[PDB]
């Protein structure tokens, strides 16, 4: 898949992703906060189509992610991220995609997600998060 790396910013304002209830997560794009103004991250699109778009609009900076969780699993021979859930201090968004495979979860007691990197081919292959205080 094509690797991407957004880098670290001052917070997150909005997450736009797309999924398919049979396969996995497809498109991924973030609107970050950069010192009080939105910074539109580059769109990281799947190599194919047919996904259902989702827009996760956060009331920044009062609302911020306190936990990211999801499932990784095999899709057509590839281990990919089949599902993602974003929990804030205000609400829970997801799960999006298929909740089967091996679960993972990152509850944050102190700190903030300020950035994402990973890889998307047909589906999201993997992904990492930047953390800071």
């Amino acid at each position: 898949g094509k690797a991407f790396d957004d880098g670290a910013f001052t917070g997150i304002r909005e997450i736009n992703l797309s999924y398919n209830k049979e396969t996995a997560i497809g498109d991924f794009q973030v609107v970050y906060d950069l010192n009080g103004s939105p910074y539109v991250g580059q769109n990281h699109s799947s190599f194919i189509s047919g996904f259902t778009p989702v827009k996760i609009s956060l009331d920044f900076p009062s609302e911020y992610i306190t936990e990211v969780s999801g499932y990784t699993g095999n899709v057509s021979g590839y281990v990919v991220v089949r599902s993602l859930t974003f929990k804030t201090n205000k609400k829970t968004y997801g799960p999006y995609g298929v909740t089967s495979g091996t679960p993972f979860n990152l509850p944050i007691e102190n700190g903030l997600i300020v950035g994402f990197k990973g890889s998307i081919g047909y589906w999201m292959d993997y992904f990492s998060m930047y953390l800071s205080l």
């Binding site: 991220v81 999201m124 292959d125 930047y130 953390l131």
Partner: peptide
Amino acid sequence: SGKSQTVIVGPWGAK
């Protein structure tokens, strides 16, 4: 180096 760094956790997914 002249680039700041941050904690990074992951990746989850393909190896």
